[PDB]
């Protein structure tokens, strides 16, 4: 949603072979490129010019400082001239921030008429980037490679997506998840290795008793709550049997108290994701719902049944998208519709699903009965899901490693409204086809719990997997279950 | 603890006719009762017949896998038994296997040995065939070699049966956690599904609120008679012999014991964990309650450590019969002295009185800072002396490792009047510095299971059955060679 | 000429034991650091870098220690229980050597006054085990030193490790200049220079002999005369020229300083421009702490510089070596180490190094001037680093140098005699099996422990051949290591 200032260090590789007139000419070319790259597809993320690097020491220092400086979200290296890779070795080793090797070229076209030797010793990026690329593969460093002219619209989009990803990665690297209660009992995919997750992604995932959150809701001012119900009334379409001071209003007031208690707790521990479990709610009047839905809109990561993995992922996919319109939500594939041309999946968690995936209008604020958790009638936001190309991502623990499964799906506007369904919902046709998406998904072992996002590209999730050093398997338009099983087997071998 | 049998099974073939198979029956039917009497009638040794046919062998192995009462199978090839017959079987066999390489006759009847005797008591090469197929299929098997009357072989069978019963208890071990792991603690954390896959452990999180409910509706009658039992069993500090705020604190532990016992019996839980960071609804951190439940055979560990609580339950059921005693344990402080390098083991409150000296544990109630709660009632006592074993199970991410440290518990020559928690002193083998170094290199937890009763042979045999590395730190351990054993094991177990 | 290096002492704890107890830890550390600084001797330097209770504090500490080129190593000790997840983000980012000091402030248990507050302070015993775990779990390269902080055994290990970690910090920033290529058809001299830079950090760069021939001729004849003057005060030189070596010494010295080189290799198969194969020059430069090896052997040259830096402080002396000849005898079964010319005067006997000038067929150049001297005596170490293609292996053979029985009048080269453990036959067999080079680093001052600790920091197999080595066991260790390290 917001918070810490993140910049990206642009770096250019050269050598002392072509002397100082060439080092000035590359520095000139860079000092022009950087600000155009900034104000065009920037504003949000600062793009620092960290100089032309020729010295082994200079490179190694730069990398160390990039690792030390919390504000450096990533390094964007480009070899304008031939920069010998053995200088980058100790540097690339010590570089703990995500690196993008930008294989570009200052001049779009070749100036056929005037192409002296001095131009071949200056705009030679074509092979200075290849030399660098070799040390990249040799040292097996996880790097994004973007190729093309730097003014190119394709390249500026890839730089912009990559910078949003590397910010999501930096937020991940010190992500703080609070779990209220443990996993839903006997559930396997919601379980995981929390310490192994800190090794891989950095996630501090820490368990609090529900009594620790009750203590926070007991401390919430009735005034701040009352103001919040005012904001509800103005923002959402409360069931008419809920504006008069009824037990229904007091049930919406209780979610307001839970929202401001959660918000208070989360902010007091700098938590950006959390998890509630219905199997442990002792001291809550009702299951956190509208509160959780509002916090997710407010951009917090969340997942039910203690699912820290998909809650973390939700936060990561929310901060992956900040700028773009789409919206990102916690999701559970609940029911299929089988029709020849209209093969739908109805996704809608228990009751906690983020308004960011809602259509042009509505958010209706209902409060029907819930059986799960055995608590008071819990207030919720209900709303039809939007439409358009989307992404359904689960993160799972295979024991020895993590696997990110991503399903490209197309959200679809509901042709029929469903009056008795007292939870927000969204329909989607999964690529390549319901039958083959679900087959491949089950084969990959994807969780029941997913992160549904319009805004997050697949490229975005694959980049984040490359940085974080996990398999990222995708099931989309081109996915053949036959080939996909083989790709699962060969990845398993690669990643262990 | 359900009633557990071992299936004694003798391999042979049809080759030497049927009279020879009748003679093998004759030998077995003599051995199996004598073997029962040797190991004690605690764990039953069923005679499950002579297996010749590949179908018969498969059927036996399938039955032993399906039957929850079959804790283990003891195979012994009397005659050459062609191992391909056992293949289909060994794959389907899900219970621990002991390959008993024995022989009926102690000595060679030099005067009367004939072709008939040679194709009867040919177990010397019959087992070696069965040995091959074992190696070939990588089956988890205990190999016991010796005459079936040798005391060493009967000791190894008895211990192996206790371990195979402990493995059967592990395999459907239910653990209840009351609250999550101590926040920011790493070795406490683990893969609970990876555990269920390796060990079978049903490890499940319960809100503390679920437990307060059980305490809130516990009969005050039972509480008063239990507190009456406390005064009998323990030497209550005098301020707790009269009705005061002290003896009420002791009553509140007794409430926590009875509620816990109720909650654990209701869910067939054999082990459980607390955490001091989630007690909302408990008046005080379970102490005397947990200590007493631990004595009563329940597996326990604090700070949400299901791995050590499971290990404690398994390590207790490994001892059932023996009177040694097993406890949850933390290595708290060292004493450095040229000839008297000691380690003081304790917990916040929770250490089983089954390791206590024969002195009657003092039932005290001092202040405890941690968890920030009421003055908790706890048993205080000095640990016994003798050879003992400190075991920690850890998750390395991909797989588990059982670190065992042989130690020698020692009686404190200097009593400790102002330590309000029970404690035990031990000299760890081979020395404090070497043990500690080797332990830290192996990544062993602060939290351990201390047992007088459990052998290293039992924990190695358990790790064999569960298919986890078991690394041992004892007299023989050198830190040089230990670091290489860790390296070379890592590669094998990946 | 040695850059200053410090070690960042850090104590683990948590907030859990209130805030008074964190003052008690502060007090304990502030006492232990000075007494440990004085115990290891004002030579290493040992900063107290504060008590760590937060994950974000621990990450900060690691990141500064990696960034700061002055931090040679970090010494972590958990005074109380320090929940190990807080160290994870930090230990991932820590690129400097870690020693996990598993100690305790109190030697004895105060049996009388052991309150709950005491147990909530002197945890170490289980606070360190938690830390140990996360170390084993992340597979971080860590030394574990256990025992009380007043133990001589602990303070000795701390010193030894600190020496090792400074040599390692000098390895990571090591620059080697090669004056010509390897000996054409030689195998054990060739290796992966990029693989070396990735494993150790060695910027090993080839120069032409023409570059050094340009540098040699531009030396002041005034400094040459002054260097000749120093020779006949330091060595009992034969009557006499030698100025060629003194010229080459100052021309190399100029080249090495100007490129910040601490190690270099010459080859005798490329000397187009040099009047004679550098001998006395290189022997002087090695004595001055430069890493060297002949026949373009950068691996041994790096290993020599690393083992010189590992020894600095002790008066042992480290040299370049080639196992030249054996002597077979009932008991006195010994080896004669030497090289063409290039042996370090730091391994000499009673001093009085002769400065002869005989002919050297090998170079095909002018009879070169050299230092000749008998090798000292005492327990020593013979280390070669080899490339197996996919990784490096440090082979270390413990030897006992022994002072020569007879004289060697006709031998125009510096030499040393040693009995290899556990015997010549076995030590050699183990050596050929481990594929050790002809070229070694012989040191009196370097311990096997040092080389094992260095290998653990550098992430390479370190195979050891000592008294306890058995050739059967050894072969098994080679196979099993092979599987672990690849
Ligand atoms: Mn769910
Ligand atoms: Mn503990
Ligand atoms: Mn040579």
Domain extents for chain B?
1-172, 173-494
Nearest to C108 among B336, B367, B421 (CB): B336
Q: Distance, CA A304 to ligand 1 centroid (Å)? A: 5
CB contact under 8 A, B421 and C127: no
* Secondary structure tally for chain B: helices H, strands E: 15, 19
Cα–Cα nearest to B387, from B478, B457, B471:
B457
From the CA of C182, the nearest ligand is 3
Within B288-430, where are the H helices?
288-295, 306-317
Cα dihedral A69, A71, A75, A80 sign: negative
Contact criterion met (CB below 8 Å) for A79 and A128:
yes
Q: How far apart are CA C122 and CA C78, in angstroms?
A: 9
Kindly identify which residue of chain B lies nearest to residue A276, measuring between CA atoms. Answer: B207
Query: Nearest C-alpha of chain A: how many angstroms from C137?
Result: 9
How many C-beta atoms lie closer than 10 Å to residue A199's C-beta? 21
CB contact under 8 A, A67 and C64: no
- C189 vs B187: CA distance, rounded Å: 45
Cα-Cα end-to-end distance for chain B: 34
CA dihedral B330, B332, B337, B340 (to 10 degrees): -30
Q: Decide: residue A188, CB within 10 A, 0-12 exposed, 13-18 middle, 19+ buried.
A: middle
Q: Where are the alpha helices (DSSP H) in C312-419?
A: none
Whole-angstrom CA distances from B313 to B201, B308, B320, B454 are 11, 9, 11, 12
C-alpha to C-alpha distance for C400 and C337, rounded to whole angstroms: 12
Q: Which residues surround ligand 2, an ion (CB under 5 A)?
A: B 302-303, 330
Q: Is A219 helix (H, G, I), strand (E, B) or coil?
A: coil
Omega within 30 of 0 (cis) for the link into C197? no
What is the CA angle C129-B392-C92, rounded to 5? 45
> Cα separation of A249 and B36, whole Å?
73
How many Å is the Cα radius of gyration of chain C? 25
Q: What is the stated resolution of the deposited model, in angstroms? A: 3.2
Is C172 in contact with A90 (Cβ distance < 8 A)?
yes
Helix (H, G, I), strand (E, B) or coil at C212: helix
Question: Furthest-apart CA pair in chain C: how many Å?
Answer: 81
Strand partners, A208: A180
Query: Chains touching chain B at 3 or more Cβ pairs under 8 angstroms?
Result: A, C
The rounded distance, in Å, linking the Cα atoms of C187 and C138 is 36
Task: Inspect the interface and report whether the beta carbons of A89 and C56 lie closer than 8 Å.
Answer: no
Phi-psi region of C139 (alpha: psi -120 to 50; beta: other; left: phi over 0): left
- Find the residue in A nearest to B274 (Cα): A209
CA distance B318 to B310: 12
Nearest residue on chain B to A206, judged by CA atoms? B183
| Contact in structure between A66 and A95 (CB atoms under 8 Å) | yes
CB A422 within 8 A of CB A366: yes
Nearest to B204 among A179, A185, A209 (CB): A185
**Residues 6+ away with beta carbon under 8 Å from A7:** A45, A46, A47, A48, A71, A72, A73
Flag whether residue C15 sits within 8 Å of chain B, measured between CB atoms: no
What whole-number distance in Å separates Cα of residue B154 and Cα of residue B150?
Answer: 7
* Contact status, residue A258 vs residue A284, Cβ threshold 8 Å: yes
Cα separation, C318 vs C305, whole angstroms:
9
Question: Any alpha helices (H) in B236-281, and if so which ranges?
Answer: 245-266
For residue B237, report the phi and psi dihedrals to the nearest 5 degrees.
Answer: -50, 135
CA angle, corner B66, sides to B60 and B70, nearest 5? 75
Whether omega for the bond prior to residue B128 falls within 30 degrees of 0, making it cis, is no
Per 3-state DSSP, what percentage of chain A is helix, strand, and coil (rounded to 5)?
40, 25, 35
Please report, for residues C89, C110, C154, C330, the alpha-carbon distance to residue C74 in angstroms, rounded to integers and kept in the order given.
Answer: 16, 31, 16, 49
Q: Is the distance from CB of C420 to CB of C285 less than 8 angstroms?
A: no
Dist CA A160 CA A472 (whole Å): 21
Contacts of B193 in chain A (CB under 8 A): 188, 191-192, 397, 399
Using the Cβ of C67 and the Cβ atoms of chain A, whether some distance falls under 8 Å is answered with yes
Give the C-alpha separation, A46 to A173, whole Å: 19
Q: Count Cβ atoms below 10 Å from residue A206 Cβ, excluding itself.
A: 22
Task: Give the CA dihedral B128, B131, B137, B140, nearest 10 degrees.
Answer: 180
The SS3 call for residue B36 is helix
CB C130 within 8 A of CB C84: yes
Q: Name the CA radius of gyration of chain A, rounded.
A: 25
Exposed e or buried b per residue across A32-48, where buried means at least 16 C-beta atoms within 10 angstroms of its C-beta: ebbeebbeebbeebebb
Task: Give the separation between CA A96 and CA A65, rounded to whole angstroms.
Answer: 10
Chain C residue with Cα closest to A93: C198
Q: Which ligand is nearest to the CA of B285?
A: 2
What are the Cα distances from residue A22, in Å, to A124, A142, A219, A251?
12, 31, 66, 71
CB-CB contact of A443 with A491 (8 Å): no
Q: What one-character-per-residue DSSP string does A18-56 give?
A: SHHHHHHHHHHHHHHHHHHHHHTT-SSSEEEEEEEE-SH
**In this structure, what token pair is assigned to residue B130?**
């069965």
Distance (Å) from CA C116 to ligand 2 centroid: 14
A332 is in an annotated binding site: yes
Neighbours of C43 (CB within 10 A): 11
Cis peptide preceding A432, ω within 30 of 0: yes
Pick among A176, A195, A203 to test the C interface (most C CBs inside 10 A): A195
Q: Which two tokens stand for residue B108?
A: 């060679």
Measured distance CA(A418)–CA(C170) in Å, rounded: 72
Phi and psi dihedrals of B362, rounded to 5?
-70, 130
B21 touching chain C per CB within 8 A:
no
Length of chain A (residues): 496
Count CB neighbours of A112 within 10 A: 6
**CA gap B183, B304 in Å, rounded:** 9
DSSP-derived 3-state class of residue A179? strand
CB contacts under 8 A, C 95-124 vs A, are 95
Q: Specify the 3-state DSSP secondary structure of C378.
A: strand
């Amino acid at each position: 949603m917001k918070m810490p200032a993140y910049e990206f260090w642009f770096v250019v590789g050269s050598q002392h072979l072509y002397g100082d007139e060439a080092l000035a000419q590359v520095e000139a070319h860079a000092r022009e490129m950087v600000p155009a790259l900034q104000a065009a597809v920037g504003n949000a993320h600062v793009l620092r010019w960290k100089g032309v690097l020729k010295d082994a020491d200079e490179i190694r220092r730069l990398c160390l400082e990039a690792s030390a400086d919390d504000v450096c979200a990533g390094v964007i290296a480009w070899m304008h001239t031939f920069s010998p890779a053995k200088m980058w070795i100790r540097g690339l080793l010590a570089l703990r921030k995500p690196l993008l090797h930008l294989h570009t070229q200052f001049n779009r076209d070749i100036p056929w008429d005037t192409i002296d030797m001095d131009f071949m010793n200056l705009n030679q990026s074509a092979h200075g980037d290849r030399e660098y690329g070799f040390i990249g593969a040799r040292m097996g460093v996880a790097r994004k490679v973007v190729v093309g002219h730097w003014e190119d619209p394709e390249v500026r989009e890839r730089l912009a997506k990559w910078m949003r990803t590397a910010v999501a990665f930096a937020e991940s690297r010190n992500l703080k998840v609070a779990r209220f209660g443990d996993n839903m009992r006997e559930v396997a995919v919601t379980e995981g290795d929390k310490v192994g997750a800190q090794i891989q992604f950095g996630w501090s995932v820490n368990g609090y008793g529900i009594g620790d959150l009750v203590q926070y809701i007991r401390d919430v001012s009735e005034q701040k709550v009352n103001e919040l119900l005012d904001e509800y009334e103005e923002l959402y379409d409360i069931v008419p049997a809920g504006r008069q001071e009824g037990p229904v209003r007091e049930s919406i007031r209780e979610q307001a108290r839970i929202e401001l208690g959660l918000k208070a707790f989360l902010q007091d521990g700098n938590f950006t994701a959390f998890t509630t479990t219905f199997e442990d709610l002792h001291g809550l009047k009702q299951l956190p719902g509208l509160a959780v839905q509002r916090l997710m809109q407010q951009g917090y990561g969340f997942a039910g049944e203690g699912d820290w993995k998909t809650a973390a992922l939700l936060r990561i996919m929310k901060v992956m998208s900040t700028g773009l319109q789409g919206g990102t939500s916690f999701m559970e594939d609940y029911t299929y519709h089988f029709e020849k041309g209209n093969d739908l999946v109805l996704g809608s968690h228990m009751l906690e699903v983020c308004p960011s995936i809602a259509a042009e209008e509505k958010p209706i604020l209902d409060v029907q009965h819930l059986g799960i958790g055995g608590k008071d009638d819990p207030a919720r936001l209900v709303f039809d899901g939007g439409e358009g190309a989307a992404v359904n991502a689960s993160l799972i623990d295979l024991g020895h490693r993590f696997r990110l499964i991503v399903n490209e799906v197309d959200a679809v506007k509901p042709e029929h409204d469903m009056p008795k369904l007292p939870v927000a919902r969204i329909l989607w046709k999964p690529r390549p086809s319901l039958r083959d998406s679900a087959e491949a998904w089950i084969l990959a072992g994807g969780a029941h719990h997913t992160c549904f996002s319009f805004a997050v590209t697949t490229e975005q999730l694959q980049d984040f997997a490359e940085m974080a050093g996990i398999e990222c398997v995708v099931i989309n338009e081109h996915t053949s279950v036959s080939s996909f099983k083989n790709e699962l087997k060969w990845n398993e071998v690669f990643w262990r």
